[PDB]
């Protein structure tokens, strides 16, 4: 997250760190949202690589023991069947991970609230992106979980020529684009939390930014629209 602030430890308890085994250690690669005690929602592109993955819930600082973490292996990966790694702009950037164990809920570990199917946010709706992704274009990962305020940019504007054009689809949410604040590499798969009727819900799964840079004016961060996939999510959980 470029232009973020450090999140309070208990603000976004559904945020997870998705990590892969690297030598004798583990490396953060993407975010995710805990949606059941044994299911995480993340981006399909986060799990294209043939890596060993684990999920960390209750994580705050990737570089120190927080005394709150639970570490769990990934038992099964279900990528949306229309996902094409060759074509992120086509959409379908979503995957569900079944965890090897059910995690225990507390102030630091909670299920993410999902929107009702089909829900679209009014232009300029208040949202926060969260994650440990790069804090600058071509920078480095955050140590502590970051948040940034990214108001939505509706489809009519986001798909306009000076924004994302045909690249953005109605199955996506755009947010930000102020040139200062944005997602960045390492935030993919994590939540966009948006305030609707007094409650934050996870309306986006972080998917892509411009190849030119993370915080680029009129290139808002683009998210898979969670409310386009409610039936898909329910069907996966029911069949697995």
């Amino acid at each position: 997250v470029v232009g973020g602030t450090e999140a309070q430890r208990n603000s976004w308890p559904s945020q997870i760190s998705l990590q892969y085994r690297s030598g004798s250690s583990w490396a953060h690669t993407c975010g995710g949202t805990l949606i059941r005690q044994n299911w995480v929602m993340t981006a399909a592109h986060c799990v294209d690589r043939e890596l060993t993955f684990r999920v960390v819930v209750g994580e705050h600082n990737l570089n120190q023991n927080n005394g709150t973490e639970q570490y769990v292996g990934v038992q099964k990966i279900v990528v949306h069947p229309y996902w094409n790694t060759d074509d992120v702009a086509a959409g379908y950037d979503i995957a569900l991970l079944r965890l090897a164990q059910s995690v225990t809920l507390n102030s630091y570990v909670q299920l993410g609230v999902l929107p009702r199917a089909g829900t679209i946010l009014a232009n300029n709706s208040p949202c926060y992106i969260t994650g440990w992704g790069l804090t600058r274009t071509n920078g480095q990962l955050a140590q502590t979980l970051q948040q940034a305020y990214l108001p939505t940019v509706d489809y009519a504007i986001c798909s306009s020529s000076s924004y994302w054009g045909s690249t953005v689809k109605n199955s996506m949410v755009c947010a930000g684009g102020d040139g200062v604040r944005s997602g960045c590499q390492g935030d993919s798969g994590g939540p966009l939390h948006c305030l609707v009727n007094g409650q934050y819900a996870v309306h986006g799964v972080t998917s892509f930014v411009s190849r030119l840079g993370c915080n680029v004016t009129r290139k808002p961060t683009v998210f898979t629209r969670v409310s386009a996939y409610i039936s898909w999510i329910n069907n996966v959980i029911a069949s697995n």
Binding site: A43, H45, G133, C184, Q185, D187, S188, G189, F208
Partner: peptide, 4 residues
């Protein structure tokens, strides 16, 4: 994609 951002991703990492």
């Amino acid at each position: 994609p951002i991703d990492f």
